[PDB]
Structures are given as C-alpha cells and as structure tokens.
Amino acid sequence: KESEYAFEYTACDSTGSRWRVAVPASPGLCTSLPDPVKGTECSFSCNAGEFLDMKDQSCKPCAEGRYSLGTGIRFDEWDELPHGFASLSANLNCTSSKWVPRGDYIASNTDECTATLMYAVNLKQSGTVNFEYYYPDSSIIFEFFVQNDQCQPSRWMKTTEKWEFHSVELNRGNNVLYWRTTAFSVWSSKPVLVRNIAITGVAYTSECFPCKPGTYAAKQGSPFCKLCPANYYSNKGETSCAPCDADKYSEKGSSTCKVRPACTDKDYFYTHTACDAQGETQLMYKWAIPKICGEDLEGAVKLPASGVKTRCPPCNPGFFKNSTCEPCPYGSYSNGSDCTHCPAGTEPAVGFEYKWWNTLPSNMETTVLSGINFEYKGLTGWEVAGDHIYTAVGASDNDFMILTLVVPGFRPPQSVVADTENKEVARITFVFETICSVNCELYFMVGMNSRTNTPVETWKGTKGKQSYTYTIEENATVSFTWAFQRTTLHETGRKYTNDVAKIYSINVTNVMGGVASYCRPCALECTSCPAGHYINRDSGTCHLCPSNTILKAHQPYGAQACVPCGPGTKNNKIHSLCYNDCTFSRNTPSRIFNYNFSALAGTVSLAGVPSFTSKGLKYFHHFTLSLCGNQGKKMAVCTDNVTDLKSVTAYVCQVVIIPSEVMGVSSQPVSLADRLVGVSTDMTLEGIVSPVELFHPETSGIPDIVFFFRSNDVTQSCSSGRSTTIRLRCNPMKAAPGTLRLPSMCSDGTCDGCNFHFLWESVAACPLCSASDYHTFVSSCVAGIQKTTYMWREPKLCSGGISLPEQRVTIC
Amino acid sequence: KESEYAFEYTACDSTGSRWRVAVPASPGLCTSLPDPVKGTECSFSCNAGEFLDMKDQSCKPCAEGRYSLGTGIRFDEWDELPHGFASLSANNCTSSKWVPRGDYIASNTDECTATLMYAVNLKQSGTVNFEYYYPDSSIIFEFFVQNDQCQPSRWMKTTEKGWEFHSVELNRGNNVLYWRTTAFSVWSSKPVLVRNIAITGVAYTSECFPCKPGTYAAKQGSPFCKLCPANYYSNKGETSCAPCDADKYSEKGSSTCKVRPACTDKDYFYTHTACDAQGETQLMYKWAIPKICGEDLEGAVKLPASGVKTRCPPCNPGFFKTDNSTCEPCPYGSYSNGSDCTHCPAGTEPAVGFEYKWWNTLPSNMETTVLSGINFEYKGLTGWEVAGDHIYTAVGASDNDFMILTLVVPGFRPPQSVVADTENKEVARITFVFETICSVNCELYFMVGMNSRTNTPVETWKGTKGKQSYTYTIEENATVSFTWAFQRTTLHEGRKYTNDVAKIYSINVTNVMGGVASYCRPCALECTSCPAGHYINRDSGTCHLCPSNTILKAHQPYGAQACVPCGPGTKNNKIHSLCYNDCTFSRNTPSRIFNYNFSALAGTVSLAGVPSFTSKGLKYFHHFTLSLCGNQGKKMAVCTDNVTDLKSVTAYVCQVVIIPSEVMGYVSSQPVSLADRLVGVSTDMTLEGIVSPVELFHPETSGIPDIVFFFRSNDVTQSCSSGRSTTIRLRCNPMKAAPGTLRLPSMCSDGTCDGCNFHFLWESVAACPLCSASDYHTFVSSCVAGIQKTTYMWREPKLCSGGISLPEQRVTIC
Numbered sequence A: 001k002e003s004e005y006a007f008e009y010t011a012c013d014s015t016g017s018r019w020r021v022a023v024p025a026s027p028g029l030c031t032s033l034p035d036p037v038k039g040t041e042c043s044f045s046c047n048a049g050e051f052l053d054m055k056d057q058s059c060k061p062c063a064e065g066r067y068s069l070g071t072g073i074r075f076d077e078w079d080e081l082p083h084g085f086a087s088l089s090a091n092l093n094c095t096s097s098k099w100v101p102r103g104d105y106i107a108s109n110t111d112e113c114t115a116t117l118m119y120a121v122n123l124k125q126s127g128t129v130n131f132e133y134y135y136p137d138s139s140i141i142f143e144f145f146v147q148n149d150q151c152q153p154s155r156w157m158k159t160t161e162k163w164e165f166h167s168v169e170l171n172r173g174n175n176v177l178y179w180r181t182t183a184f185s186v187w188s189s190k191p192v193l194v195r196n197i198a199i200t201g202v203a204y205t206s207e208c209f210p211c212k213p214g215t216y217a218a219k220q221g222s223p224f225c226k227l228c229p230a231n232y233y234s235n236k237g238e239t240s241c242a243p244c245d246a247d248k249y250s251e252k253g254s255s256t257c258k259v260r261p262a263c264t265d266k267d268y269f270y271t272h273t274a275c276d277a278q279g280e281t282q283l284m285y286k287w288a289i290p291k292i293c294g295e296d297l298e299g300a301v302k303l304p305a306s307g308v309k310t311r312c313p314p315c316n317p318g319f320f321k322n323s324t325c326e327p328c329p330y331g332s333y334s335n336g337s338d339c340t341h342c343p344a345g346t347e348p349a350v351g352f353e354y355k356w357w358n359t360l361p362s363n364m365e366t367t368v369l370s371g372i373n374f375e376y377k378g379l380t381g382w383e384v385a386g387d388h389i390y391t392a393v394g395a396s397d398n399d400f401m402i403l404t405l406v407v408p409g410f411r412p413p414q415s416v417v418a419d420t421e422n423k424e425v426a427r428i429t430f431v432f433e434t435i436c437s438v439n440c441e442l443y444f445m446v447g448m449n450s451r452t453n454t455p456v457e458t459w460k461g462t463k464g465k466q467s468y469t470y471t472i473e474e475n476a477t478v479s480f481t482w483a484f485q486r487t488t489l490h491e492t493g494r495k496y497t498n499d500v501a502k503i504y505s506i507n508v509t510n511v512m513g514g515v516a517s518y519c520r521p522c523a524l525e526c527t528s529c530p531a532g533h534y535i536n537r538d539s540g541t542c543h544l545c546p547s548n549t550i551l552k553a554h555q556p557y558g559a560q561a562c563v564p565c566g567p568g569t570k571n572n573k574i575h576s577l578c579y580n581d582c583t584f585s586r587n588t589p590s591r592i593f594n595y596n597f598s599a600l601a602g603t604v605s606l607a608g609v610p611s612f613t614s615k616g617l618k619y620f621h622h623f624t625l626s627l628c629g630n631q632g633k634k635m636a637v638c639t640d641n642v643t644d645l646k647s648v649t650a651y652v653c654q655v656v657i658i659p660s661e662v663m664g665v666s667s668q669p670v671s672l673a674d675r676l677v678g679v680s681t682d683m684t685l686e687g688i689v690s691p692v693e694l695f696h697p698e699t700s701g702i703p704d705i706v707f708f709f710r711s712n713d714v715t716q717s718c719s720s721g722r723s724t725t726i727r728l729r730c731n732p733m734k735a736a737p738g739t740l741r742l743p744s745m746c747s748d749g750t751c752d753g754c755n756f757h758f759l760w761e762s763v764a765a766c767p768l769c770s771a772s773d774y775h776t777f778v779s780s781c782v783a784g785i786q787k788t789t790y791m792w793r794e795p796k797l798c799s800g801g802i803s804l805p806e807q808r809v810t811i812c
Numbered sequence B: 001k002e003s004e005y006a007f008e009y010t011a012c013d014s015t016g017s018r019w020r021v022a023v024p025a026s027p028g029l030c031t032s033l034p035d036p037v038k039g040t041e042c043s044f045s046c047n048a049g050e051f052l053d054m055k056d057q058s059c060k061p062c063a064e065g066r067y068s069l070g071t072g073i074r075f076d077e078w079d080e081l082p083h084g085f086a087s088l089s090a091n092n093c094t095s096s097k098w099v100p101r102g103d104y105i106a107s108n109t110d111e112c113t114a115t116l117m118y119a120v121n122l123k124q125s126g127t128v129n130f131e132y133y134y135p136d137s138s139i140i141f142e143f144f145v146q147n148d149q150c151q152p153s154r155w156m157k158t159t160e161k162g163w164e165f166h167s168v169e170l171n172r173g174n175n176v177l178y179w180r181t182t183a184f185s186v187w188s189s190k191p192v193l194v195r196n197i198a199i200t201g202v203a204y205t206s207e208c209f210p211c212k213p214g215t216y217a218a219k220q221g222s223p224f225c226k227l228c229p230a231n232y233y234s235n236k237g238e239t240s241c242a243p244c245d246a247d248k249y250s251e252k253g254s255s256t257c258k259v260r261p262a263c264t265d266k267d268y269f270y271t272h273t274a275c276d277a278q279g280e281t282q283l284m285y286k287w288a289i290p291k292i293c294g295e296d297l298e299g300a301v302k303l304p305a306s307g308v309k310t311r312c313p314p315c316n317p318g319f320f321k322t323d324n325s326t327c328e329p330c331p332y333g334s335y336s337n338g339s340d341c342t343h344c345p346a347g348t349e350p351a352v353g354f355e356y357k358w359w360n361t362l363p364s365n366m367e368t369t370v371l372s373g374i375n376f377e378y379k380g381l382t383g384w385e386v387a388g389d390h391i392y393t394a395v396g397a398s399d400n401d402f403m404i405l406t407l408v409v410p411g412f413r414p415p416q417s418v419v420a421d422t423e424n425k426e427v428a429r430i431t432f433v434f435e436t437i438c439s440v441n442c443e444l445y446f447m448v449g450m451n452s453r454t455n456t457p458v459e460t461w462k463g464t465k466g467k468q469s470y471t472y473t474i475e476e477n478a479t480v481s482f483t484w485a486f487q488r489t490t491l492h493e494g495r496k497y498t499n500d501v502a503k504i505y506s507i508n509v510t511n512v513m514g515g516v517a518s519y520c521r522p523c524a525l526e527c528t529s530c531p532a533g534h535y536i537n538r539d540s541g542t543c544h545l546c547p548s549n550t551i552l553k554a555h556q557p558y559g560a561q562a563c564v565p566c567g568p569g570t571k572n573n574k575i576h577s578l579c580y581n582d583c584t585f586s587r588n589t590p591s592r593i594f595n596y597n598f599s600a601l602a603g604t605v606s607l608a609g610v611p612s613f614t615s616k617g618l619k620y621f622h623h624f625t626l627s628l629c630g631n632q633g634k635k636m637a638v639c640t641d642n643v644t645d646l647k648s649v650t651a652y653v654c655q656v657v658i659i660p661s662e663v664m665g666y667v668s669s670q671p672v673s674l675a676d677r678l679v680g681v682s683t684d685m686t687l688e689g690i691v692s693p694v695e696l697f698h699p700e701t702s703g704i705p706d707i708v709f710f711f712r713s714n715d716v717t718q719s720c721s722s723g724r725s726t727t728i729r730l731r732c733n734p735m736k737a738a739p740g741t742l743r744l745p746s747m748c749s750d751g752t753c754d755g756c757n758f759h760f761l762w763e764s765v766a767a768c769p770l771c772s773a774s775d776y777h778t779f780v781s782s783c784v785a786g787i788q789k790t791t792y793m794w795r796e797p798k799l800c801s802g803g804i805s806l807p808e809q810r811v812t813i814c
C-alpha cells in the first residue's frame, strides 16, 4: 500500500547521482514496491522553504505553523551552551570567566583574560553567519574570525550604540568560528552580548518541525516563527496566538500565562503636573507604564489620592514668568520675577541653567533602557518633582533610566578664546544625590558631535548631596547623559524603586542661545582686550598686569584677576601661565648658588616596574615630563592608542601601557601637572609636601632643587587633585640627560594615591661653578719664583661656569 | 535479471539504520526488483580484507592481485604533491617548499618554515603512520596534529641506521596534519625525507582496486601488493611477477623493462689482491657489483687484463711480517719498522695506537659500507677498496652514492703524564691524507661518534683538494666511530664520476688499547707517572720540577726541553702546566713605573653583538664569554649549546651563536674556543705574531698605554689557517663602572673583521694605574703670617685609582 512504504534517497555515488527508493515502514512488511527513480545531486537547498517532499521532486512550501529553518541551523535559545559550542578561557581563576549563558542572550567575561566561544561546523556548501552582537563597553575587545579547514586565520568588531547585526561569508571546508573577548584595553566592566547565531549551508536538506510553543507561523513557508506578542497565549504548532485571559498576563513570547500579581506601593511614581492657568501645581500619581499587576485584586493599594494644589516653583534663571516658563530675549538677566535688560557695557551670560523643575526643558530628553534585553523603550525615565528631578520606575529593577541633556554649541567668551593655552570651552555641574541601598550605578557619559559615548564618571552606592564639574575641551554638539540603574541583579519585578537618584540642578555655561542670570561687568570698548590685559568695569580700558602675575581667563574682572607667580617662576609674554626659565638661583649667607637646567628642557620619559595584576595581565605605567624653558608651553602630549588600534597637554603626564605582546597599547592618559606652584629648596610649598624620606639621602649636602607642580582636575579618589614634585639632584658623574627615578618603596607611581614624586639625578642640576668654588694656594717665592695656581676642588659639585685662572708667576 | 540490477545502500538515517536496495543498471530498466533488506550500521571496516560485496553482508577477501587498501588512504607516489596535500612555506621561500623529489619527498634546506599540511575528515578514530628520514639536525622536524577545534610529542627524533617509523593516534574530528621543518638550529644543509603516509579510518568502506603495474599480490586479501623484485616484469593486476628477459633489466618495482646499456670503462674499479704465499700480489679488476650493463653487446670494453705480479707493500708499523706474508700484530711491548718488531727495554715504553699506512687488506677495525642516493639505505657491500699506496674510493650503485669508510677504536689509554694534568683536554688524535681528484659537487665527510653516540660531522670538505691532512683531538675516552663519506655528486641522475676519486694515504690514531707501536718512547726510570709538573730525562731516571716561568707540555714530556718559558706578564701555576696572569701588570717608564691590578675584572663577563639579519628572515647575534685573569688561571668560561637538548668548551674567551628565542619558541649553538692560551700581556701592539690594530678602536684621550692581552687558540680549521687569535684591549676610564664596558670593533658587527681574530676592548676604572706616590700635586707655601700649608692634592686630570692615600695637609711654623 502507498501508506505502507515511504520513499527514501540512496547514498551518493562518486558521480553524485542518487536514487529515490520506496522502503516499507516495517522490515520486510510487503512486496511489490515501486521502482527507483533518479533525483537531484546534493544541492537541493530551498532556503527556508525546504520541505523537500520525496513524492514530488520539488521544494513544496510546508504547512502553516512550522518553522522551516533552512539549509542551516539557528541558535536563538541559549538556556545552556548549545550542543557543539565550546567556551574556553585561557590566562596569558578564569574557570568562571567563560561566556555565561545568561538567557536568550549570552554574556562575555568582565575580567581581563581570554574567553573564546568556539563553534566548528562542517559547512557542506558555502554559507554565512549572522551573529547579532551588543558591544557597549570599549574595555573588552571583541573580534570574530573564522578559520578554514587548514586552520588558517576584518576580525576586529565595531563598538555598538543605540544590538547590531553582522555577516561573514564561509567556504565549504570545516569552518570554525571564534567569538573572543579580552578585557585588557583599559585595565580600569560591562559584558558583551551576542544572540541569534545563524549558520547556513550545513545540511543540504531539512524538514520543517512544528513551531515552538510561544510562537506562531500564520503564513506557510515562513523562514522563522513570529515571536508572540505580550499577554497572549500560544501552544506549539498553533496557527496564531490565542489571546490570554484578563487575570493572566504573559511576557513577550511566553507560552504559559501567569496570574497578574497584587499591586504594591512600589509600583507608583509621583510627578508634578504642568502648571495650569491658575498656577497651582498638583502632585500626580501614575502607574508604571509596563503595568503587570491588578488593582481589583485584594491586598493591593489603590491609586493614592493626588491633586493637592501648591504654588508652582518660580521660573528658572533666564526665563520670563499664562504662568508658563519661556525664555526672554537675550541681553537681559532674570532673577525669576522678570528679566531686567542689561546695559550695553555689561556682558550677557551664555549658557543653560536648570534648577526648578516644572517640566522637562526643550533640550532635556528622558529614555528608559531595559536590563533584560537592552533596547531603548524611552517611555519616561526621569520625572520632575519641583525641587529635584526624580528617577522614574522602569519596566524592571535592572533598567537604565537615562536622562540626556544635549547642548549643540558653546560660545567662548572673548577673553578666554584669546589665550590658546586655556583649554576650557565650557563646564557642567549637578547635585547627584542618591538614596540608594545596594548595587546601583549612576553614570555621567559625555558624547561630543555624535562621537561614541565615553563614561566621564561612574558613581556607585549610596551618596550624598554632592556635585561635579567637567570642563568641556572642544566645541561640539555634546550629549550629556545620566544613567541610573536600580540594581545589577537580574530578578523578575520591581524591588528597589525607593532607591532613587536625584539631580537638584544641572548648570551649564557658555552655550549658544543661552539664557543669563549673571550680567558680566566688562570694560567698555565690552570687547576683546589684547592678550594679557586685565579688565576694570569702571575704567573701560585694557591694561597689562604687572610682572610676575598671570591673568586667569575664566574671570578677568577687576584688577584682582591676575595672581602673582610662585617662587622661582616668571610670567610669559602673554602673561597667561607662570613658567620657569631654566635657571634657578638659591642664595646662602656665605655664597649665592646659580643653576641652569637648559640641558633638561627637553621632554623625558620613564616607565615604572612592570607589576602584575590579580589576573595574568601585567601593567607598567609610562610618565612623560617637561620641566623648564620653551616659553613654558606644555611640551608633553600624551595619547591613547587603544581606541585607534585622549590627548592631554601637561608638564608631567602618566599613561598606563598594556604590554605589546598581550595585544599582539597605551591607556588612561591623565595630566599629573598643569601648573607650576613654585620652585624652591623647601620641602613644603603651598600645601604640596615632597617627602625627603622617600628617596635616598643626599651625600653632597647641598640642597635638592624641588619643582612643585599641581593638577587642576578633581576626581573621586583625589579630593584636592594630583600634585607632583620633581626633585633635582646634583650628580657630577651621571649623564647630562640624567636619570629619572620613581620612589623605591612605591613603584606603581602613587603610594599616596594622588602625588607623583620624582627624582632627576644629573650633572645639569649641579650649581654653576662659582668664582669662589676652587682652591687658592699661594707661595711667596721659592728660589725667587711665586707659584700661586688655582685648582678645582676634588669634592666637585659644580659644572660649567667660570674657568680655572691660569697659573700665576711673578718674581718677588 | 540478477545481472540487470546491483544492490546499493541507502542514505544513513538519524538512528544509523541503513537499507540495502537493488537498483537497475539502466534508469528504469525493468521491474520486479528484490525487496530491501537491512544492512550494516555505520562503521563496518574490514581493514584490508574489505571487499564488502552487496550479496553477502560480511566483508570478503577480494581477488588475488588486487590491493584492498583499508578503511583509510595510503599516499605513496609523490610524483606530484597528491591531491589535498598543501605545501605552505613562510619566512624568496617560494621555492623553499617540500619538493616532491620522487618516491620520497624532501624538506627545505634554507632557514625558513616549510609545512606539509593535510586535512582529513577522519570518520572513525585511526592512526597516521609516516616513515621519515632525519639525517641532519640543523633542520628541526615536527609532526603535530590539530583537532576539529584547531587546538594544538611534537618534536621528532634524529634518525640513524636508515629510515624510521612513527605512528600517532587520531580522533573522529576533522584532523589536520602538519609536517614542519625549519633549518634554524645551527645557522651553518641536508633535507628531511618522509614516505608512506598511511591514514586509516577515512571512509568506513573501500572497494578492492586492481594492484598497480610493477607490483604483485599472489595472496588474496593482500593489505598492499608487494613491489616487484628487480629485473622482473609485472603488469597491473598480475597474480605474480613475470621474469624479464636477459637483454632487458628493470629496477625494483618497475613495470616496464629497459634494454641493458652497453658497458663502458667507467663501470670498473681496480683493486690489489691479498698477498699470496708467494708474496707477489696482483692488480685485479671487478665489474660494478650492481651490474646493469652487458659485455656481449658491441661497443663495450671487456674486463681489462689483470694479474701483473708485483711485490706486496711491507706490513704496517706494528705488525710483524710472517713467512706466510700475512700482516698481523706482534706482541705488546715492541716496535716495528716493517722488517721485524724489535723488543723494547723496560726503560722505554710502547706507543699505544693504531697506524694504517700500507693497504693490502682492510684491517680488522676497518669496515666499508655503501649508502645509496636513491633510497638512502645502507647496502654496505664494498665502498672503499685498497690500492697499496692509497685506499681507493670504489664505484657505488649510483652516481649519488655515499661510499662510507668507517674506523672503530675500542678505547684510548692516556699516557700517565697526560692524565696527571686535568687541564689538558687531549685523550687521542687522528690524521689522514685526504686527497681528492674530484670534478664537481662532491663532498668528503668526516663524522665522529664516540661511545656509540650519534654522528656529528666534525669536518666537511668540498670540491677538488690536494694532498693534505687533518688532526682532530678526541675530547673523551670512548668507543669512537671515525667515518669517512664520499659522494660523487649531489645531482640525481647511471654513473659518470668514477674518475673523481677520494684517496686516503694514511690514517694515524694514537692512544688506542691493544694498539701497535712504532715509536718506543723514552721515559725516566722509576717509567711511572711523575709528580705533577715534573720534566722527564731518559738518562736521569728521576722526575724534576721545571724552573719558574716555564710550563710543561703534557703531550711530549721528553728531555729538559719539554717545558717552555712563559710569555711576558704571565707566571706559571702550581702544577706548572699553563701560563696564567695574576691580576697585575707592571709597566715601567723611564720617569716612573706603573702598577695595575685587575682583581675586579677576574670574574667572567659576557657580551652580545649587534643582531645582524641573514639573507633570509632569520637574524643572528653572537655571544662571547670572557675570562681574563686570576683564579689560578683556570678557564672559567664554560659554553654549551642549548639546542641539542631543546658541546661544552672550556676557554678564556668563547664565541657561541645565539639564535633568537622568539623564532624557536623557547637556542644557542655552534660553541667554539676563541682562546686557549695566554701568549703574553704587553703594551706592544704586536706579540708573537698576533696583531691588535690601533685603527679599529677609538684613539685614547688619556695618552697612557692600553694593555693588550694576547690570547691564541690551538684549533686549526678550514677558514683559519693558523688558528683564532683574540686580543682583549684594556683601557683606563675613571668614569666607567668597575665591572666595565666591553665593546667589539665598530667596523665589523659580527665580531671579526679579518675572519679569525676577535679583538675586544674593556673600558673600566680597574684598568687604570694604581695611584702612585708621585701621581699628585705638591704645593709648597711660604709661611704667610708664620703658617706653612704645603697641602697635597690629587691631580685634576686624574687617571689613577686605588693605590696610595692622599697625604694629610701640612701645618708647621717657620
């Protein structure tokens, strides 16, 4: 009978010809089977419609509700590591540092060691791989490279903004696919996620299986089932999703519905309503937008009563108070009642200040990022609360409630733009309060002119009413973004909605089209004064500051603007920065010394002792120094290779250097020195202490010249900012370029954590040979010959300077 | 009909079950086919008993004369790189890939990577059985298999005695096989040969092919049909080889016979017969023993008339002539001039050792063997034949053959005086006349293997040469295998270079147990081991110490003239064996005498030259180890090659070549002794023939003379006629550190501008003179206010160090 036997192909011959043969279902069931007929030759791939019915030698689209795959394999569902996938970790213990199958997505390794996801496939015909990856953090470096059958080697992968797609072509011989991640770029993470692997060409033939539960395929020949929309039921092989009951809610593509939970107080978030014509703002309560709980269920608190009328907060400085806050014309400043017009002489202030929150300003945008799938829903991430701006309730406790301030351009004040040495284009601040309990991370990422976001700061744990001042270094459309995460733990539901960050105000200066609250008093032509000219509002004229004083371009107001230079330094031509001509001059009561470091003016470098990490990676820092001369311009420029695969101008710079062998390599450039506090023989100067105990005691006994630097930047670890001292030591035998030495007891660079103390032993640091630093030996006359000749002192500590006088002979 | 259809297997299912189905030969030929029947599941490999007919499920032995292969694949014919084999070469090395020479494949001689890659989809677990030849150790040959995940006993043994067999297990995954050879061990080659690759487990099933022509399989189910023996005819599929005609000869495993060529005069090699009882030998002619030519063919010269009676050469020194005219050693304790060995007095001593000058027959220790150039196997029949005055180099099977002569010594007895001194490295020597008459591309080899160890080529001569010699000094008592190998040419082609013949006129070896004597040494009477450093006079009969500044030569401690005065600046040690320098020189000028003291420089110091690249991608930088003075003048620089472990020479200066560790993956080799004696220490630039040029190094600013330590090496090589001479120049630098700075000449970075002399320069403060009592300033001061201050102060242009202390200041009232 026709139903008794099922047709079947024969084994391929040398020529590739094949035979289609009827075989009984039971071994030796019956006789009188149909004769064999030839068939296609191993290339019958129908590309996701391949039912490949044996009865008809053609590709017939198969029944609805059945994922047909294709001539390939899909790896969507990563409950565990799918069969054949190898997760290997190697150290250059990382047993736990393998690609963890978190769920529908697999995650990378955060620590600094290799983690390879290996798949070796016998791709019978040429095909492709379509791994869809998420690459947020540039710390981990992520590459995908395929080896041929001979195990022979565009591997490096792009950083992702906004899940990203990729495709690579494959040949027919035993391709092996590597997904490798090593977190060695920064040494400072955030894992890398890949999902939906799609190899093609594996099988030459496939049969369409019933569609997996929780998915539907209404149209026949569907390459893959459509994932079921939320709150809908779906069984395996169903033509379309069946809507679920009201009392039961199902997640996106969930086969089994679950009872809607009882509502709690944690599901609320309170907002201030927009001010009406009456001007009485009312507190309002709104349920979470992805609501899943049921209010009708017993034990669930109803929506709390809201609508208490209270006076609106006054309009922000720069907006004129229909009670709606809107900007008032430029050239005027507002205290809140009404913006008063400025005189022509006084200067308006450009920039945006956001203190009182009645509604999100125009540049403000708020978006939500999910922690389970990492897509930007963007419903409402931060809500206004009048005094502060709240952090709303997300879909889940892992959500990144993202607030973004985007400012297009910064108008530099005329005085600041005049000095090229000044690096400030404008600055931002905040009051990043928190009331967090555990495992939260407030991020403050800055992205200029559509460049990739780089996290300027990342606060963690509970904090207090604080602040932050980032100095923008370039004119660009910046995207100031603040990201709050309730918890790093992955758990179903909302738990830490009470752990709310707050931003009481975000003041930004020097913004084109900005409003003003300060009406700057400037000297009448105000106008750009010539370089290095102080400004008096009443004088209306530009005058040069007195010698040994440097004008601060930030606030060139009054004659008090420019500050006297520190000891041992002289002001440059622009009168902008105190610098040191390469000569120092120390005077003792017996004699006055004189030095000259013009041989040390060139930039010098030093690398610390390579110190291994907790993992197998070893790190050694690199410091670049500029000391004296060259009009006191910062000659040490220090960059970061790793991004290319920032640039800071400073007198001393530190860059971490990952070993070149590991990468197959600089990182974290910082400016250890941005000013010259002073040059003096004293150990302490203006709060910077250079410990004499760190270095070896000086044998000569003459004082050691100490250069006292200081850095402007204030970080989380450094309260007052980095302060570096370069100690100069007189050493006649050592080379003129000298030897640069970090302290012995701490080799990483800062056993204090913020102060980098150096030591420069050279002959240039030795005092200039004075006219009294030699021997006088007088002989009256021996046989009527006066021999008074002058010799250098063998305990020589001087170099250069005056020459030996010629021997003196004069008969008595 | 049964002949109309042939059964066949169906495609394997998920469960592994399979169906056997009869299919008509023609498409739709006829109906009424037999029903399917279940067949074998997955692997059913019969492993060379596999015919696997469809009628019977069991594997059957296929017909005779047919190789059944196995469940794998056999690669045997490398006329071209077989399909699937990849020959990838990386550092032009495009030509430096594995060349398919013929039945065997060869490696790359130059110094760059050459990989033979084969990637196989091994369905079931199996093995790879590659038979390889690894003569030279300069190339390093690795065989390592990568699994399906491309994941990594890689290094392979050296081969002697011919060809060796290796097997490695394999897995089910797609396995790729690497045969990699890089010639980066010694930098000084000889290729590496592999044959008969035999993968198993590839296909789960094979069909019984007919056996290739030129081979036979008489027994059914033969795993591989045997190669046809020589001079026999064989066609494909024949049950057994058919003997070939007399007129046509066929090589081993040759399907088609070839007519025997006409004989030429080049096929002869002449020999001297053994000395008969009459005592008159005769020249004899024997045809080339693997004869392939025909004498009956026209144009071929017959065997030359031989048998001219001439007197046998006299017996070698140490063998007594017999009435039977046969040479045989005579009793120990006597020396022979040839007529008869005269008994020696107890006061004189026999000389242990073997001398071979006159060739009537191969002595007992001699063996001669032939190595073929086509199959590299030791036929061993007769390579070198005797010719009276010289030992000939007879004709091999082919024109690429290695006619190998071997000398074997049981062990060497050190003379009592020599063994007394541990510093002496002499255990035995050797010598030869190594004439040649070669035309092109020959290579006389001299390899030495002691105590049955592996053979290392001590020397390798090439091209035409003349009557010469060589004196290798054996470094240890052992069983040595002195081997000579002569190759007619490197070109692979018949024989045409029978005229170009190496000859060895004499092979003298000293200090051999059971050895015969021709010199009857004179010792002083109790000859017994004299106390260390005692000269010997045969008439005196007493051991006396040599006078100071003289060192006794342990090789020839005869007479009072044995010990030679030491060179300038040196003093003899306690043993009076070697001149050494206590770390102090003393140069005197007419104005003042200097005094140095180098005790800070006694420790061994090292230096590496500037890394210089090869013509290929490899770069080499040398490593020199120096020992200068003190420590009783014992050679503190021991230098050894790493790579052989993956020799050790004691010398004052040693050069070793450091191949970079990155290339090897972990490497120093070619050690040599640049200095074995101290000729003398002097401020003169030339001393006893060693010249240390002043132009090489920068001129001295101080102006005081620079000491030039004058060394010298005993070894004489092909490149160095007189032996390497190294001079260490010491320069006074007050600023330089006490260990000092060591610098090679700037003109030649490799180390030697000349090619044999290594001049160094050591700048340090230790080389500076000791501060003399006259190397400072005296400054008399007449009493000013009745105060005299004649204080003493060092000279500002200081060039001294250490020495006398600066005197205290003077204060005396006038």
Ligand SMILES: *[C@@H]1O[C@H](CO)[C@@H](O[C@@H]2O[C@H](CO)[C@@H](O)[C@H](O)[C@H]2NC(C)=O)[C@H](O)[C@H]1NC(C)=O
Pocket (backbone or CB within 6 Å): A581, A582, A583, A596, A597, A598, A599
């Ligand atoms: C520091 O020493 C230098 C060298 O003696 C002084 O002289 C200058 O040297 C530089 C090269 O280093 C030359 O280019 C200048 O022409 C030299 N003269 C001057 C006036 O600069 C140098 O003057 C010393 N420093 C000071 C401040 O006097």
Ligand SMILES: *[C@@H]1O[C@H](CO)[C@@H](O[C@@H]2O[C@H](CO)[C@@H](O)[C@H](O)[C@H]2NC(C)=O)[C@H](O)[C@H]1NC(C)=O
Pocket (backbone or CB within 6 Å): A605, A622, A639, A641, A660, A665, A666
């Ligand atoms: C990254 O950039 C730095 C320079 O900023 C490079 O550093 C040099 O590396 C070489 C090789 O080790 C050293 O010889 C130099 O002394 C280094 N100079 C400095 C200033 O660091 C480094 O090579 C770059 N990394 C790359 C190209 O991978």
Ligand SMILES: *[C@@H]1O[C@H](CO)[C@@H](O[C@@H]2O[C@H](CO)[C@@H](O)[C@H](O)[C@H]2NC(C)=O)[C@H](O)[C@H]1NC(C)=O
Pocket (backbone or CB within 6 Å): B582, B583, B584, B597, B598, B599, B600
């Ligand atoms: C050269 O210098 C070394 C040390 O710098 C001297 O060595 C001393 O030798 C005496 C005996 O002669 C010992 O008692 C001392 O203990 C040695 N010194 C040290 C530090 O161990 C040596 O004498 C000097 N002169 C010569 C010719 O070698």
Ligand SMILES: *[C@@H]1O[C@H](CO)[C@@H](O[C@@H]2O[C@H](CO)[C@@H](O)[C@H](O)[C@H]2NC(C)=O)[C@H](O)[C@H]1NC(C)=O
Pocket (backbone or CB within 6 Å): B606, B640, B642, B661, B666, B667, B668
């Ligand atoms: C080959 O041998 C030489 C000396 O026998 C080794 O040279 C020293 O190796 C150590 C460790 O590798 C280094 O720290 C030294 O700097 C090397 N030189 C000296 C003078 O000590 C060499 O390492 C050996 N190479 C290998 C691969 O074993």
Ligand SMILES: *[C@@H]1O[C@H](CO)[C@@H](O)[C@H](O)[C@H]1NC(C)=O
Pocket (backbone or CB within 6 Å): A093, A094, A095, A096
């Ligand atoms: C180190 O390896 C051992 C395996 O012996 C493992 O038990 C341990 O957890 C590893 N260390 C860490 C920090 O995981």
Ligand SMILES: *[C@@H]1O[C@H](CO)[C@@H](O)[C@H](O)[C@H]1NC(C)=O
Pocket (backbone or CB within 6 Å): A317, A349, A350, A351, A352, A353, A507, A508, A509, A514, A515, A516, A517, A518
């Ligand atoms: C930011 O604060 C400064 C503090 O002096 C103030 O002058 C400035 O006006 C503020 N920014 C704006 C845009 O108002």
Ligand SMILES: *[C@@H]1O[C@H](CO)[C@@H](O)[C@H](O)[C@H]1NC(C)=O
Pocket (backbone or CB within 6 Å): A408, A409, A410, A411, A449, A475, A476, A477, A512
């Ligand atoms: C620089 O500032 C101007 C003025 O705000 C702005 O229009 C421009 O886009 C900025 N430069 C860039 C981002 O190229």
Ligand SMILES: *[C@@H]1O[C@H](CO)[C@@H](O)[C@H](O)[C@H]1NC(C)=O
Pocket (backbone or CB within 6 Å): B092, B094
């Ligand atoms: C360099 O390689 C080329 C192949 O591109 C080859 O033709 C040439 O002979 C090589 N050079 C030498 C010196 O062999």
Ligand SMILES: *[C@@H]1O[C@H](CO)[C@@H](O)[C@H](O)[C@H]1NC(C)=O
Pocket (backbone or CB within 6 Å): B317, B351, B352, B353, B354, B355, B508, B509, B510, B516, B517, B518, B519
């Ligand atoms: C080797 O040559 C030397 C030459 O001095 C000779 O005295 C000695 O007898 C020779 N060897 C033998 C074993 O005769």
Ligand SMILES: *[C@@H]1O[C@H](CO)[C@@H](O)[C@H](O)[C@H]1NC(C)=O
Pocket (backbone or CB within 6 Å): B410, B411, B412, B413, B451, B477, B478, B479, B513
């Ligand atoms: C050393 O020489 C003796 C001489 O009789 C010999 O028997 C012995 O085998 C030699 N040493 C070795 C290790 O073979």
